[PDB]
Every structure is written in structure tokens, then in C-alpha cells.
Amino acid sequence: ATIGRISTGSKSLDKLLGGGIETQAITEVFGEFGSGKTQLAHTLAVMVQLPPEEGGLNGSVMWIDTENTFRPERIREIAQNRGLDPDEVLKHIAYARAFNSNHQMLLVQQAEDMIKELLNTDRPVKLLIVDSLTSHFRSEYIGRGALAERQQKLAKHLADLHRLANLYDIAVFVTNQVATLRVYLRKGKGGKRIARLIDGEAVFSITEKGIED
Ligand SMILES: Cc1ccc2[nH]ccc2c1
Ligand SMILES: Cc1ccc2[nH]ccc2c1
């Protein structure tokens, strides 16, 4: 099945990514606190809902939040400035807070039910966000013997995500505070954000349109 490509809102970043973030893939953004990872997530949750000729996939969204950082009003704001209706856009984001890492893993299995339901409708799920992929795993797996167990659980979680991405043609987008594709993000001068691929650089600003050049 052809890979779909979701515009980030930044032409610079889109170019770096080869046209946008890919379906049938997990794109992992890395960066320090305040780098803009969650702003990119909010922007993508809007962009994906655009028609293909405007950089989207006419898609629905599922969002797993581990840090209570999802902001419906930010979504409304971005939607308004991208030519979309803020209420309709929010309606197409299925939102869940993950209580701990085990519940986070279960929510991915739960997501498949809605994915199946919407699959052959005109608004299939096309983006699954996990923000943050690792925050619960970091806080819970501490002490002698914990590392091997943390890593096994995280591997299983990533495998579950890859399966949804590949089986249902979805872009999975995850954040990691300091992957088929790893992107390092950092805040620079004048509040500009700079992105680099791991294993040129794109530059963008955070604005009322989400992100743009
Ligand atoms: C952190 C947190 C708190 C309350 C919740 N209810 C459902 C999920 C969830 C997660
Ligand atoms: C409503 C809903 C149900 C299951 C889910 N899994 C991930 C997000 C999510 C949202």
C-alpha cells in the first residue's frame, strides 16, 4: 500500500522529512523540555484532517497523553488558521490519558477497536500520537534489575505501535524527552526551532498556525 504523507505545517521540516511524516512508520521526535515536541503533535493533529491537496489525509486522530499536555483550545486555534472548522477538528481527535506505563500499553490495544471501526469510512484514523512515549517508563523502572524489564516492555509497546502503523496505514508520531525515523528538535535564537534527522536542518517558528517557516 502506498505511503501517505502528512504535512507538518512547515515547508522546511516537510522537505527534511521527504514530504511530511509517513504512514506505516513511527516518527519519534527527541528534544529537551520546551523544545516544541508537543506543539508539533498539536499541529499534526490538525494537518492530518486536511484533504490530500492541502497536505493532509482526511484522517481521524487518536491521542495518548501521559503528561496532561493536550490542549483542546490550542487545537481550535490551529484549526481556525489552517482553513478548517475548530469544532469538527476536535470531534475527530479521540483522546485518552495514560495513567501509567501498563495502562499506556493497554490503550494501544484498545485503539485498534476504533481504528477498525473507522477504517473503511471517509475519515479513517491516519495519525496516532503518543506524547510522551517514555515518561512513565522513565519514572517507574528505577533500581537494580529495572533496566532489562523497562526495555522489554518498551520493545513490546513499540512492536504494538509498528503493527498498527503497518496493518492499518497510520502515521504513528511519538515524543521522547531528553522509531523508523528519529528527529532531534531544539530551541534556538529568537525562539526558532531547529530540527535534524538522526542516523541539513529545518527551521521553523511556533505560531497561531501551529508551526510555519
Ligand atoms: C494520569 C491520569 C489520571 C486520570 C485518568 N483517568 C483516565 C486516565 C487517566 C490518567
Ligand atoms: C476514546 C479512545 C479509546 C481508546 C484509545 N486508545 C488511544 C486513544 C484512545 C481514545
Author numbering: 108 to 285, 309 to 329, 336 to 349
Excerpt from the paper describing this PDB structure:
In this work we have targeted the protein–protein interaction between the tumour suppressor BRCA2 and the recombination enzyme RAD51. Consequently an alternative strategy using the RAD51 orthologue RadA from the thermophilic organism Pyrococcus furiosus was employed. The quadruple mutant “MAYM”, which lacks the E219S and D220A mutations, the side chains of which point away from the Phe pocket and do not contribute to the shape of the Phe pocket, was found to crystallise more readily in a form suitable for compound soaking and was used for all subsequent crystallographic work.
These were 5-hydroxyindole (1) and 5-methylindole (2), which gave thermal shifts of +2.0 and +1.5 °C, respectively. To quantify the binding of each fragment, the dissociation constant Kd was measured by ITC. Both 1 and 2 were found to bind with a Kd of 2.1 mm. A titration of FHTA against protein preincubated with 5 mm fragment showed no binding of the peptide; this suggests competition between the two ligands. To gain further insight into the binding of the fragments, both were soaked into crystals of humanised MAYM RadA. The indole nitrogen proton forms a hydrogen bond with the backbone carbonyl group of Leu214.
